Design an enzyme around this catalytic site. Structure first.
Site, PDB file in Angstrom:
ATOM      1  N   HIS A   1      40.554  44.919  32.907  1.00 40.23           N
ATOM      2  CA  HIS A   1      40.940  44.057  33.989  1.00 40.23           C
ATOM      3  C   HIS A   1      40.162  42.730  33.944  1.00 40.23           C
ATOM      4  O   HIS A   1      40.729  41.653  34.143  1.00 40.23           O
ATOM      5  CB  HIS A   1      40.719  44.750  35.325  1.00 40.23           C
ATOM      6  CG  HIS A   1      41.234  43.953  36.472  1.00 40.23           C
ATOM      7  ND1 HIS A   1      42.579  43.824  36.736  1.00 40.23           N
ATOM      8  CD2 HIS A   1      40.595  43.201  37.396  1.00 40.23           C
ATOM      9  CE1 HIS A   1      42.739  43.060  37.804  1.00 40.23           C
ATOM     10  NE2 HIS A   1      41.555  42.646  38.209  1.00 40.23           N
TER      11      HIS A   1
ATOM     12  N   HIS B   1      34.077  44.039  39.602  1.00 37.56           N
ATOM     13  CA  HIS B   1      34.416  42.914  38.716  1.00 37.56           C
ATOM     14  C   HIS B   1      34.344  41.591  39.470  1.00 37.56           C
ATOM     15  O   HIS B   1      34.498  41.575  40.682  1.00 37.56           O
ATOM     16  CB  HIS B   1      35.754  43.070  37.964  1.00 37.56           C
ATOM     17  CG  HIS B   1      36.987  42.914  38.790  1.00 37.56           C
ATOM     18  ND1 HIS B   1      37.589  43.956  39.473  1.00 37.56           N
ATOM     19  CD2 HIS B   1      37.800  41.842  38.957  1.00 37.56           C
ATOM     20  CE1 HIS B   1      38.683  43.514  40.064  1.00 37.56           C
ATOM     21  NE2 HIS B   1      38.830  42.229  39.771  1.00 37.56           N
TER      22      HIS B   1
ATOM     23  N   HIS C   1      40.595  48.041  45.287  1.00 36.72           N
ATOM     24  CA  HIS C   1      41.803  48.093  46.089  1.00 36.72           C
ATOM     25  C   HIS C   1      42.066  49.559  46.473  1.00 36.72           C
ATOM     26  O   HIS C   1      42.418  50.342  45.624  1.00 36.72           O
ATOM     27  CB  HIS C   1      42.976  47.510  45.288  1.00 36.72           C
ATOM     28  CG  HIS C   1      42.798  46.052  44.965  1.00 36.72           C
ATOM     29  ND1 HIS C   1      43.141  45.051  45.849  1.00 36.72           N
ATOM     30  CD2 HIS C   1      42.300  45.421  43.866  1.00 36.72           C
ATOM     31  CE1 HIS C   1      42.876  43.873  45.310  1.00 36.72           C
ATOM     32  NE2 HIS C   1      42.360  44.064  44.113  1.00 36.72           N
TER      33      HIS C   1
ATOM     34  N   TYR D   1      49.179  39.632  33.081  1.00 35.92           N
ATOM     35  CA  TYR D   1      48.469  39.404  31.827  1.00 35.92           C
ATOM     36  C   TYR D   1      49.407  39.501  30.630  1.00 35.92           C
ATOM     37  O   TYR D   1      50.263  40.404  30.548  1.00 35.92           O
ATOM     38  CB  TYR D   1      47.365  40.445  31.607  1.00 35.92           C
ATOM     39  CG  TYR D   1      46.190  40.476  32.573  1.00 35.92           C
ATOM     40  CD1 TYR D   1      46.136  39.685  33.723  1.00 35.92           C
ATOM     41  CD2 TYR D   1      45.116  41.311  32.315  1.00 35.92           C
ATOM     42  CE1 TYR D   1      45.082  39.741  34.574  1.00 35.92           C
ATOM     43  CE2 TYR D   1      44.038  41.371  33.160  1.00 35.92           C
ATOM     44  CZ  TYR D   1      44.013  40.590  34.281  1.00 35.92           C
ATOM     45  OH  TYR D   1      42.937  40.654  35.122  1.00 35.92           O
TER      46      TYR D   1
ATOM     47  N   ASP E   1      38.619  38.167  44.894  1.00 36.45           N
ATOM     48  CA  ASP E   1      38.890  39.209  45.885  1.00 36.45           C
ATOM     49  C   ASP E   1      37.853  40.356  45.939  1.00 36.45           C
ATOM     50  O   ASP E   1      37.974  41.204  46.805  1.00 36.45           O
ATOM     51  CB  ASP E   1      40.349  39.736  45.810  1.00 36.45           C
ATOM     52  CG  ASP E   1      40.717  40.309  44.465  1.00 36.45           C
ATOM     53  OD1 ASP E   1      40.204  39.837  43.416  1.00 36.45           O
ATOM     54  OD2 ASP E   1      41.535  41.249  44.370  1.00 36.45           O
ATOM     55  N   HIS E   2      36.837  40.367  45.071  1.00 34.42           N
ATOM     56  CA  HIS E   2      35.753  41.362  45.168  1.00 34.42           C
ATOM     57  C   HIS E   2      34.367  40.772  45.217  1.00 34.42           C
ATOM     58  O   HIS E   2      33.483  41.336  45.874  1.00 34.42           O
ATOM     59  CB  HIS E   2      35.882  42.406  44.058  1.00 34.42           C
ATOM     60  CG  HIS E   2      37.280  42.898  43.915  1.00 34.42           C
ATOM     61  ND1 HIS E   2      37.860  43.748  44.833  1.00 34.42           N
ATOM     62  CD2 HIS E   2      38.267  42.520  43.074  1.00 34.42           C
ATOM     63  CE1 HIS E   2      39.122  43.946  44.502  1.00 34.42           C
ATOM     64  NE2 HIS E   2      39.398  43.207  43.437  1.00 34.42           N
TER      65      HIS E   2
ATOM     66  N   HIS F   1      36.014  38.899  40.219  1.00 35.71           N
ATOM     67  CA  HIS F   1      37.117  38.138  40.761  1.00 35.71           C
ATOM     68  C   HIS F   1      36.861  37.785  42.215  1.00 35.71           C
ATOM     69  O   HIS F   1      36.056  38.433  42.887  1.00 35.71           O
ATOM     70  CB  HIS F   1      38.458  38.900  40.632  1.00 35.71           C
ATOM     71  CG  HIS F   1      39.066  38.824  39.267  1.00 35.71           C
ATOM     72  ND1 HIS F   1      40.054  39.694  38.836  1.00 35.71           N
ATOM     73  CD2 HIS F   1      38.841  37.973  38.240  1.00 35.71           C
ATOM     74  CE1 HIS F   1      40.411  39.369  37.603  1.00 35.71           C
ATOM     75  NE2 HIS F   1      39.711  38.309  37.230  1.00 35.71           N
TER      76      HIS F   1
END
Ligand code: PHN
Ligand code: CU
Ligand code: CU
Ligand code: CU
Length: 266
Positions: A159, A83, A224, A190, A87-88, A85
């Site tokens: 997500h 995805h 993660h 969320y 952090d990825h 975001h």
């Protein structure tokens, strides 16, 4: 008299940023990210595939790990994403500039990547990163083939709208190993119910739990590692306690159900 606040950087636990040497998952597949963020290198005779890069500041570390594996910048052919975001997908723009790599992603992930994760449905502009463009748009169930290794996309919206599980069959000990890299199924902070930006959020998460449960899945990995009970710092026993896709989907759905009840109360 009071100035507007300074911009706040997206800061994360130290373990998310702690470099590690490459950890082999199967014959062609290696974890090359940090201790607490997955970045998978799949090496083929015809170039390498990267699935996720972690945070924006991980680019040089990823290339150092690729070099340690015999993958030069020109050898990196394709980048796939769980995805989009920060952090990825953080270092993706920089990886494209510094390597041969082209990006393949679904329409949702491509649109979010192109805005650098700004105007996020839930996070607004709080968690952004350098924008990148997708070179190829994939549909649900579409396959991409690199050096004979076939990667299948399974959409698992929730997500993020474009959240995706990628599956491929590597080997170990002369036997097939069906790897499932399944996206996050969390919903951190969320609004789940009646969200004007995502009206069918709950229905999508439910369908996504079912999708994850049914994946071809000898070995589950997640963006993660903790979500699937991997411990990348534990060497030969990194993957010993890993969840099945079934158990991961179930744990996520129970957490999600608890979150819904708390939201209604809150
Ligand atoms: C050379 C070496 N290993 C491979 C290939 C070519 C092609 C496909 C494939 C699929 C799974 C595991 N190894 C290979
Ligand atoms: Cu092989
Ligand atoms: Cu995310
Ligand atoms: Cu994340």
């Amino acid at each position: 008299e009071v100035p507007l606040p300074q911009l706040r950087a997206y800061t994360v636990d130290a373990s998310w940023l702690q470099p590690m040497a490459p950890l082999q998952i199967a014959d062609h597949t290696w974890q090359i990210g940090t201790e607490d963020l997955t970045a998978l290198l799949v090496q083929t005779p015809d170039g390498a595939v990267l699935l996720d890069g972690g945070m924006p500041q991980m680019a040089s570390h990823l290339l150092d790990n690729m070099k340690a594996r015999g993958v030069t910048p020109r050898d990196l052919r394709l980048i796939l994403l769980s995805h989009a975001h920060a952090d990825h997908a953080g270092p993706v723009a920089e990886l494209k500039r510094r390597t041969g790599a082209k990006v393949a992603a679904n329409a949702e992930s491509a649109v979010l990547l192109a805005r650098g994760g700004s105007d996020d449905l839930h996070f607004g502009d709080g968690i952004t990163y350098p924008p990148a463009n997708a070179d190829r748009i994939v549909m649900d169930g579409e396959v991409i083939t690199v050096g004979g290794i076939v990667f299948t996309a399974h959409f698992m919206a929730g997500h993020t709208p474009g959240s995706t599980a990628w599956t491929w069959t590597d080997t170990r000990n002369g036997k097939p190993v069906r790897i499932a890299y399944a996206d996050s199924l969390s919903a951190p902070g969320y609004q789940l119910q009646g969200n004007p930006r995502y009206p069918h959020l709950i229905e999508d998460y439910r369908r996504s739990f079912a999708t994850v449960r049914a994946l071809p899945c000898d070995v589950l990995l997640t963006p993660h590692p903790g979500a699937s009970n991997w411990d990348y710092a534990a060497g030969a026993r990194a993957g010993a306690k890993a969840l099945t896709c079934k158990a991961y989907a179930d744990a996520a759905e129970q957490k999600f159900d608890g979150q819904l009840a708390k939201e209604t109360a809150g």
